C-alpha cells in the first residue's frame, strides 16, 4: 500500500549539488500527523536523521546539515525532491525514503533505499560473462551456472534471469571495493548439472547509471 | 544433602499474582523436545534445595 | 545520542532484552520510543511504535516497557527466524536519535560443515582478458570465514577481502571469493587451493 521507491541519480562528483527523489503512492500528504522525510545510513554504523517534511509546509532538518539539506514538496505528482550540495567522501549510504503517518509512530513503512556513493570515477560498461561448468568444475557435485560481471564502478546493480522468471533460489551476493578499484558479483541460483541445456539462461543485467541492458545466453561450453 | 523441599527454576511464561501453579510434565528446555528421556538439551524440573 | 550494547545474544528459546541506554541529556521524558527490525540485504521494517502498544499484522510477541528512563525489547520464543539489527529510535528535542548498532546473532546453530566447489573460467572470458578464477564458499552458519590461499607459489589476496556479507533464506552468510587473474592463461597454473578455515572444520 506504500511504496517508498527512490529514485534518481547514484553518482556524484566531488563538492557537487545531489538531487535526489522518492515517488510515493497510496497515501497524501494532506491529512494531520502526515510527514514524508529522509533517512540514510553509512554501511556500517548506525542511521541519522538528514530531515522530515510535513503537511503544513514544515520543512524541519538536522542541526548538522542546516544549510544544504533543502527539501522541498510536490503534491501534484506526489513526490517529494531532496537537495544537498557540498558533496564530501563521507556522504556515502542508502537513502531510505520514510514515511511518517503519526507522530507516536516513528516511521511506520519505509521504502528501498538507494546506495549513492561519493567518488570522482565515472561509469564503465557490464562485463557479463557465462560460467559454464568444465572439467575441472567437479568437487561435491554443485556445478551452478554463473555470468559473473566485473569492470563497473557504480556498486547498485541487480541479477535478474529471463526478466523475473528463473529467479527461484537465486543465491546471487554482491562483494564490496576490490583493491583495483572495480566491483564484482555473481550469481548461485541453485541449478543443477543435469538441467542446464534445455532451459534458456539469460541473466538481464541491470545498471542504473549506464542504461546497459546487455543479453548473454548460457550453454555448455567446451574446450 | 536435605532433598526433601523442592522448587521450579525453569519456565517459559510468568505465573499471574496469587496462583498455585503445580507443573510435573517435564519441561521443554534448550531448542529439541526430548519427551521425558532428558539426556541433552533437556532438564528436569522440581530441582533439588541443597 | 543515546547508544546501546554490541551483543545481547543469546540461546534459542530463553528470552534476552535488548535494553538500549537511555541519555536523557537530549529526550525529555522518553514519550514516544519506536524500534526497527532491519534485515541484512533490506531496508528497516517497524515491529514496535510505542512504548507497548505494537502495530497489528506483523506481532507475533514483541513487547517493551519503559521502567523511568528506557525501555527493552523483551521477545521470549521467536528466536529462529533471523539474526537481525535492533535499533531503538525516540524523539530528541531538537532531531530523531537512531541509537547504534547492535548484531544480535543465534547463539548455538548446527554448525555444518563449509563447501568447496571450484569454478574455472568458461571460454567465454578467457579470450576477452577477464579470466576470473571464481570460488563458491557456502553452507555455514556463523559469519563470514576467511578465506586461506595455499596455491604452492604464496598467499595472495587478489581480491579476497570482501567476505560477501549477504545472507540467504537458509540464514547462512556465503564468503564467496574471486581471484584476478592474468589475460590468457590457463595451462602455466595449477588448481588453485581453496581450503577455508571454519569454526569446526577447518579444512
Known amino acids: 500500500q506504500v511504496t517508498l521507491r527512490e529514485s534518481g541519480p547514484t553518482l556524484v562528483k566531488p563538492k557537487q549539488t545531489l538531487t535526489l527523489t522518492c515517488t510515493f503512492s497510496?497515501?497524501?500528504?494532506?491529512?494531520?500527523?502526515?510527514?514524508v522525510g529522509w533517512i540514510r545510513q553509512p554501511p556500517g554504523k548506525a542511521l541519522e536523521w538528514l530531515a522530515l517534511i510535513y503537511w503544513d509546509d514544515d520543512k524541519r532538518y538536522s542541526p548538522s546539515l542546516k544549510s544544504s539539506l533543502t527539501i522541498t514538496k510536490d503534491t501534484s505528482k506526489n513526490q517529494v525532491v531532496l537537495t544537498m550540495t557540498n558533496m564530501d567522501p563521507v556522504d556515502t549510504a542508502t537513502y531510505y525514503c520514510?514515511?511518517?503517518?503519526?507522530?507516536?509512530?516513528?516511521?511506520?513503512?519505509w521504502g528501498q533505499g538507494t546506495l549513492v556513493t561519493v567518488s570522482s570515477a565515472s561509469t564503465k560498461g557490464p562485463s557479463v560473462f557465462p560460467l559454464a561448468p568444465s572439467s575441472k568444475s567437479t568437487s561435491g557435485g554443485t556445478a551452478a551456472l554463473g555470468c559473473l560481471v566485473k569492470d563497473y564502478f557504480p556498486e547498485p546493480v541487480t541479477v535478474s534471469w529471463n526478466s523475473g522468471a528463473l529467479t527461484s533460489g537465486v543465491h546471487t551476493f554482491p562483494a564490496v571495493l576490490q583493491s583495483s578499484g572495480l566491483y564484482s558479483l555473481s550469481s548461485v541460483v541453485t541449478v543443477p548439472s543435469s538441467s542446464l541445456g534445455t532451459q534458456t539462461y539469460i541473466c538481464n543485467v541491470n545498471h542504473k547509471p549506464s542504461n546497459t541492458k546487455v543479453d548473454k545466453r548460457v550453454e555448455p561450453k567446451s574446450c | 544433602g536435605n532433598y526433601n523441599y523442592l522448587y521450579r527454576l525453569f519456565r517459559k511464561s510468568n505465573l499471574k499474582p496469587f496462583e498455585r501453579d503445580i507443573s510435573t510434565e517435564i519441561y521443554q528446555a534448550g531448542s529439541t523436545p526430548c519427551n521425558g528421556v532428558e539426556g541433552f538439551n533437556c532438564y528436569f524440573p522440581l530441582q533439588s534445595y541443597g | 545520542a543515546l547508544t546501546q550494547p554490541a551483543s545481547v545474544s543469546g540461546s534459542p528459546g530463553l528470552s534476552i532484552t535488548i535494553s538500549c541506554t537511555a541519555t536523557?541529556?537530549?529526550?525529555?521524558?522518553?514519550?514516544?520510543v519506536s524500534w526497527y527490525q532491519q534485515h541484512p540485504g533490506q531496508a528497516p521494517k517497524l515491529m514496535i511504535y510505542?512504548?507497548?502498544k505494537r502495530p497489528s499484522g506483523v506481532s507475533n510477541r514483541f513487547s517493551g516497557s519503559k521502567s523511568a528512563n528506557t525501555a527493552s525489547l523483551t521477545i521470549s520464543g521467536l528466536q529462529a527466524e533471523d539474526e537481525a539489527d535492533y535499533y531503538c529510535?525516540?524523539?530528541?528535542?531538537?532531531?530523531?536519535?537512531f541509537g547504534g548498532g547492535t548484531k544480535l546473532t543465534v547463539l548455538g546453530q548446527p554448525k555444518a560443515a563449509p563447501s568447496v566447489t571450484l569454478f574455472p573460467p568458461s571460454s567465454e572470458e578467457l579470450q576477452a582478458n577477464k579470466a576470473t578464477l571464481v570460488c563458491l564458499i557456502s553452507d555455514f552458519y556463523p559469519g563470514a570465514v576467511t578465506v586461506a590461499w595455499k596455491a604452492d607459489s604464496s598467499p595472495v589476496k587478489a581480491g579476497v577481502e570482501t567476505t560477501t556479507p549477504s545472507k540467504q533464506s537458509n540464514n547462512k552468510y556465503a564468503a564467496s571469493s574471486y581471484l584476478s587473474l592474468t589475460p590468457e592463461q590457463w595451462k602455466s597454473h595449477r588448481s588453485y587451493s581453496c581450503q577455508v578455515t571454519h569454526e569446526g572444520s577447518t579444512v
Open positions: 497510496g497515501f497524501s500528504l494532506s491529512t494531520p500527523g502526515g510527514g
Open positions: 529510535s525516540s524523539y530528541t528535542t531538537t532531531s530523531v536519535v
Open positions: 536523557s541529556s537530549d529526550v525529555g521524558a522518553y514519550n514516544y
Open positions: 520514510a514515511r511518517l503517518t503519526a507522530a507516536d509512530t516513528i516511521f511506520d513503512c
Open positions: 510505542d512504548v507497548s
